[PDB]
């Protein structure tokens, strides 16, 4: 009857947008991470941290706008507004990249709030919390890429920047410096993504082509009401179709829909482990037996060595500007180039 | 020789590859878009050197 | 000694054997190139 | 090629050990009722 139970009743009121105890952490953190990105990409520059323009006010479009990471000299500083760097100045806070840690940290607790929102609502309606368990993969991906990776390198500088074009640069950086395509943990992560996209398309199409005729309309969408007890599509006909076309086929609905949870969730977890290894530069960059052979046999060539030559080009050409704090200066005569080009 | 510059590229396991690096190499750039079945080469040895199997597959 | 009432039997049907054999045979084919290196 | 010497026994046991684990559990299931 106390104030605690009175407050508990108000939070769990069945309204249009459910609040809940998790909302006290979710709503303010999700609103500031997004609003901070919209404020950054619209007004804020990145001239004194990267030497780049990155707002609509400077002339960037939706593809090139970004909230760039702080400079490399800032280290792993939290860059708090009241901290020893900005010293309370909001203008100087934006000029050194305070919004990047403002978005990463508020967005991190926002993810925690949303996952707690999945646990809270699942308990109230009395369902199994498998949706919350599935959200663990997007969280492990966000933590390893945006937090564990920059903490392993020199600073927040080499973390991803919240932008469409700044993310494309992130992948090309990982190809040239990490050979991230050769890492078997990204390969399993690729299989979990492309596999989940396969299951999502093949399950929805199989359902749409094995339905029962429960209606008189040529568009078979009105022949369904949520309160049936019978299946809307034939499970035994879909099993025979895929048994004769592909060889095997699902025979259990509960296993099928768990398999659609396991494949994409496990894939993202494996790719998060590979990024945790790259924070220490523990790469899958080379095959030693290949390099011992290719170094003493100038006629041995494989697609592995051809890709390493491409990696050596990405590093030597993008480094001077992508890493301006290093003050790289490469004369024209040291740049790796093929013939003519 | 995929690029047609007399620079062959090893692609099979018995020639120093693994599952990650092995590959069936595309046909030579000297052929271009020309149809190149087995019976257009003077033998199999010529057919394998110019990336013949890639088109058949 | 009286027997333990907490004991349960274990099962693994035929389909789970194929799925498991497929997983470790593919994980081996993927990782073997890195074991030899 | 100069590959690792333990890579052979690494792959062999990586296949064998979890294989027999599933095989033991399956044959003991079909021998039930």
């Amino acid at each position: 009857r106390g104030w605690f139970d009175i407050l508990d009743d108000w939070l769990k009121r069945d309204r249009f947008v459910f609040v809940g105890w998790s909302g006290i952490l979710l709503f303010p953190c999700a609103y500031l991470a997004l609003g901070g990105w919209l404020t950054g990409t619209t007004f804020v520059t990145s001239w004194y941290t990267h030497g780049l323009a990155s707002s609509y006010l400077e002339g960037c479009n939706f593809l090139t706008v970004a909230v760039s990471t702080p400079a490399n000299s800032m280290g792993h500083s939290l860059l708090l507004l009241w901290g020893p760097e900005a010293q309370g100045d909001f203008t100087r806070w934006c000029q050194l990249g305070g919004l990047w840690t403002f978005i990463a940290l508020h967005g991190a607790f926002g993810l925690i709030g949303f996952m707690l929102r999945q646990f809270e609502i699942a308990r109230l309606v009395g369902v199994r919390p498998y949706n919350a368990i599935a959200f663990s993969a997007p969280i492990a991906v966000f933590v390893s890429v945006f937090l564990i990776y920059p903490l392993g390198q020199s600073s927040w500088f080499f973390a991803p920047s919240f932008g469409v074009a700044a993310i494309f640069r992130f992948l090309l950086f990982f190809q040239g410096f990490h050979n991230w395509t050769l890492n078997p943990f990204h390969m399993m992560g690729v299989a979990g993504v492309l596999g989940g996209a396969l299951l999502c398309a093949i399950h929805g199409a199989t359902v749409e082509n094995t339905l029962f005729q429960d209606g008189e309309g040529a568009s078979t969408f009105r022949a369904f009401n949520p309160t049936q007890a019978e299946e809307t599509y034939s499970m035994v006909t879909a099993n025979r179709f895929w048994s004769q076309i592909f060889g095997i086929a699902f025979s259990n609905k509960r296993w099928l829909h768990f398999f659609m949870l396991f494949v994409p969730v496990t894939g993202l977890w494996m790719s998060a482990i590979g990024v945790v290894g790259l924070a220490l530069n523990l790469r899958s960059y080379d095959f030693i037996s290949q390099e011992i052979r290719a170094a003493e046999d100038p006629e041995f060539e494989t697609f592995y060595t051809k890709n390493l030559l491409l990696n050596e080009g990405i590093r030597a050409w993008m480094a001077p500007q992508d890493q301006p704090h290093e003050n790289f200066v490469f004369p024209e005569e040291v740049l790796p180039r093929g013939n003519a080009l | 020789d995929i690029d047609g510059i007399r620079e062959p590229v090893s692609g099979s396991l018995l020639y120093g590859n693994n599952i990650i690096t092995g590959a069936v190499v595309p046909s030579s750039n000297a052929i271009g878009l020309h149809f190149y079945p087995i019976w257009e080469a003077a033998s199999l040895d010529e057919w394998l050197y110019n990336g013949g199997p890639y088109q058949l597959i | 000694m009286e027997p333990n009432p907490n004991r349960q039997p274990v099962e693994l049907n035929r389909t789970s054997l194929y799925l498991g054999l497929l997983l470790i045979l593919v994980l081996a084919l993927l990782f073997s190139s890195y074991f030899f290196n | 090629m100069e590959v690792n010497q333990l890579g052979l026994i690494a792959t062999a046991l990586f296949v064998l050990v979890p294989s027999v684990f599933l095989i033991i559990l399956y044959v003991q299931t079909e021998s039930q009722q």
């Binding site: 095997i248 | 396991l13 | 389909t15 194929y18 | -």
Partner: peptide
């Protein structure tokens, strides 16, 4: 030893296909 190890694993996966199709557990209706 490498080439024999890769093709041996490849042959097992193909042999695994033959049993998972023609020696599967029949799905039965009730």
């Amino acid at each position: 030893m490498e080439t024999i190890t890769y093709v041996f694993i490849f042959a097992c996966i193909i042999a695994l296909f033959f049993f998972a199709i023609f020696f599967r557990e029949p799905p039965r209706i009730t």
